Design a protein around this ligand. Structure first.
Ligand SMILES: *[C@@H]1O[C@H](CO)[C@@H](O)[C@H](O)[C@H]1NC(C)=O
Ligand SMILES: *[C@@H]1O[C@H](CO)[C@@H](O)[C@H](O)[C@H]1NC(C)=O
Ligand SMILES: [Ca+2]
Ligand SMILES: [Ca+2]
Ligand SMILES: [Ca+2]
Ligand SMILES: [Ca+2]
Ligand SMILES: [Ca+2]
Ligand SMILES: [Ca+2]
Lengths: 156, 146, 146
């Protein structure tokens, strides 16, 4: 089993791999975008934009399982890559490997007031104002964790 | 290693399958026990004139600062228990060579002469016939007591 | 002008202090300035495995052995302070993850939080003198100007 934790979403976070009854991390040594492509497509998250290292999503609490991932970007599982082997690692938890995938989505307001922006495919972007029902504004405001309703306003 | 292991066998290691290194980068370690003091010219193997090697040449140690604690530590290093006495003069021989003026300041509680604080800079000259010596007890089970 | 205490100092291999080195005995004698000793110790910090002398992996000497600096929090300010310490010109790049190769000895410094204007890397705050969690794969490097 593979999972991403502390990512603020579903398709991002520190890569946690499961082995021997414990959830362990992956060291970020030689953890390039090819390694991130495998875990993102394995998790049904499309391609990958970032192969984050140096514990970008926090330092994991578990035995580092893999050290030198040499994925070609074509296999469907992370453990099918060429690595040093299970448990063989010379890394700490300060350099756990995490990924940010194509299907990772984040929401923000930039001036809780400002232009509604959505983060998809690794690039921030606005949201169309057409057919913006009050329920959608309430959902957006609630997702920002600051309201349950809001008002659509013209650009500043 | 955590630094507290008794042997490198107990150290956890992290092997790498790829290329390791070049011989032009081999590691060398210098430890603190470099004294190289031995016992020579004695009836029983581990007593006699104290002989010390520095600067690539052996030499006899002066008895001016050769207290009974130094003899005790030297006997412990050579695994012969305690030191019975330090016979002054050339009882075991003056020694064919020069006299080393090293002033070991052992407290008698260390098991190696390298652990002792040795002072050899500017030490006063020693008479030729005043060469330090030691007669160890010879019993390994014998241990020093305060 | 001060007198001369000791002369003919002959240090062997092994002592890290001068007072374990044999020499001629102390004598309070006047000394001409010509025959006194003036020694300039080599630089505390050197750059190794670089194409020139102003670029390479940061090596620092402390605790008796040459060490390295980890790349954690190794920004361009650290490269600037290293470059001005070695006497090279302004810094250009501050490499990470042992770009020029893995280093020697222990890892003396990591997370050096320099402001880029310190006189030397020792005045720069850090997790100093060992116990750094970094390995030798994360040795920090710089690129100064010739
Ligand atoms: C992801 O990669 C892009 C490509 O340059 C970069 O701009 C962005 O800062 C990266 N984000 C993270 C979190 O590494
Ligand atoms: C260091 O900087 C010089 C000056 O631009 C450059 O020519 C050289 O390639 C740099 N070295 C590295 C390893 O980047
Ligand atoms: Ca590694
Ligand atoms: Ca790393
Ligand atoms: Ca890889
Ligand atoms: Ca003494
Ligand atoms: Ca690092
Ligand atoms: Ca810094």
């Amino acid at each position: 089993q593979l999972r991403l934790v502390n990512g603020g979403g579903r398709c991002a976070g520190r890569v946690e791999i499961y082995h021997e009854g414990s959830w362990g991390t992956i060291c970020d040594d030689s953890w390039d975008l090819s390694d991130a492509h495998v875990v993102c497509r394995q998790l049904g998250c499309g391609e990958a934009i970032n192969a984050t290292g140096s514990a970008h999503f926090g330092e994991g609490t578990g035995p580092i399982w893999l050290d030198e991932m040499k994925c070609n970007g074509k296999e469907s599982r992370i453990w099918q890559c060429h690595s040093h082997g299970w448990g063989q690692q010379n890394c700490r938890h300060k350099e756990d490997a995490g990924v940010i995938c194509s299907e990772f989505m984040s929401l923000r307001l930039t001036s809780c007031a400002g232009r509604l922006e959505v983060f998809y495919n690794g690039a921030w972007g606005t949201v169309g104002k057409s057919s913006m029902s009050e329920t959608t504004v309430g959902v957006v405001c609630r997702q920002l964790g600051c309201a349950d309703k809001g008002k659509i306003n013209p650009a500043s | 290693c955590e630094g507290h292991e008794s042997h490198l066998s107990l150290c956890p290691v992290a092997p790498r399958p790829e290329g390791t290194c070049s011989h032009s980068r081999d590691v060398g370690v210098v430890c603190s026990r470099y004294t190289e003091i031995r016992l020579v010219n004695g009836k029983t193997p581990c007593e006699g004139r104290v002989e010390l090697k520095t600067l690539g040449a052996w030499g006899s140690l002066c008895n001016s600062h050769w207290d009974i604690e130094d003899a005790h530590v030297l006997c412990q290093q050579l695994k012969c228990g305690v030191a019975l006495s330090t016979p002054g003069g050339a009882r075991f021989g003056k020694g064919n060579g020069q006299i080393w003026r090293h002033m070991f300041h052992c407290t008698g509680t260390e098991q190696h002469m390298g652990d002792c604080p040795v002072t050899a800079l500017g030490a006063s000259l020693c008479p030729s016939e005043q060469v330090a010596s030691v007669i160890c007890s010879g019993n390994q089970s014998q241990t020093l007591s305060s | 002008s001060i007198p001369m205490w000791v002369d003919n100092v002959q240090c062997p291999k092994g002592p890290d202090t001068l007072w374990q080195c044999p020499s001629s005995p102390w004598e309070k004698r006047l000394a001409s300035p010509s025959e006194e000793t003036w020694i300039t110790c080599d630089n505390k910090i050197r750059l190794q495995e670089g194409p020139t002398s102003c670029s390479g992996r940061v090596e620092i000497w402390h605790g008796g052995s040459w060490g390295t600096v980890c790349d954690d929090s190794w920004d361009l300010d650290d490269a600037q302070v290293v470059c001005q310490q070695l006497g090279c010109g302004p810094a250009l790049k501050a490499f990470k993850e042992a770009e020029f190769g893995q280093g020697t000895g222990p890892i003396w410094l990591n997370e050096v939080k320099c402001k880029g204007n310190e006189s030397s890397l020792w005045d720069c705050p850090a997790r100093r003198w060992g116990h750094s969690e970094c390995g030798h794969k994360e040795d920090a490097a710089v690129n100064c100007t010739d």
